[PDB]
Amino acid sequence: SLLVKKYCKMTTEEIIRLCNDFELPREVAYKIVDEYNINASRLVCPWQLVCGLVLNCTFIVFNERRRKDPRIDHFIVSKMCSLMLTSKVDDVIECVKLVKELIIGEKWFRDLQIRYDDFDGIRYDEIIFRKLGSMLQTTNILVTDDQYNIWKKRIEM
DNA sequence: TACAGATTTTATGTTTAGATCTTTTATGCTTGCTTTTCAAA
């Protein structure tokens, strides 16, 4: 598996072509390249770092269609194990959980979360009522209005 | 004015909460030396 081999050396072309497999814009891929170039000589398994960075970027870039459809979350992680030569899925989840704490406090990741409105999966208007202890926050019991509208369109079609 | 009772004043004892200083002991930095896994060939 690609998550096991150590001390690999990579080119910029491999990183920028692996970034375009998941449909990322140019500046996000450039920030992924720069985050790799900062920690170039102080790295053990670069494939894990690149995999988890392109993951944590493509949940943020594709959060709204993940809210539209949940199985895309099972589609991006299925595309990753079909490229990283890894049989199981839990290694990729532990990989992204491990690389998440390395970029959490940085300015570019904060600006990405601001610009694409991810904030660990929910809007600012929802997270400011969840942290305040507002009981009037939207609970995860009923479906959303857009989901009800597209379901009613599916019924009428 | 006048005296009985209530309250204040002054004085001392009892117990608790806490400060300050002193002494002995733990701990952390410094320097030198030796062990032991780690990225590279």
From Swiss-Prot:
It is found in: Nucleus. Transmembrane segments: none annotated. It comes from the Eukaryota. Component of the origin recognition complex (ORC) composed of at least ORC1, ORC2, ORC3, ORC4, ORC5 and ORC6. Interacts with ORC3, ORC5 and TAH11. Component of the origin recognition complex (ORC) that binds origins of replication. It has a role in both chromosomal replication and mating type transcriptional silencing. Binds to the ARS consensus sequence (ACS) of origins of replication. Present with 2970 molecules/cell in log phase SD medium. Belongs to the ORC6 family. This is Origin recognition complex subunit 6. It comes from Saccharomyces cerevisiae (strain ATCC 204508 / S288c). The lineage of its organism: Eukaryota, Fungi, Dikarya, Ascomycota, Saccharomycotina. The gene is ORC6. The chain holds residues 271 to 427 of 435 of the full protein.
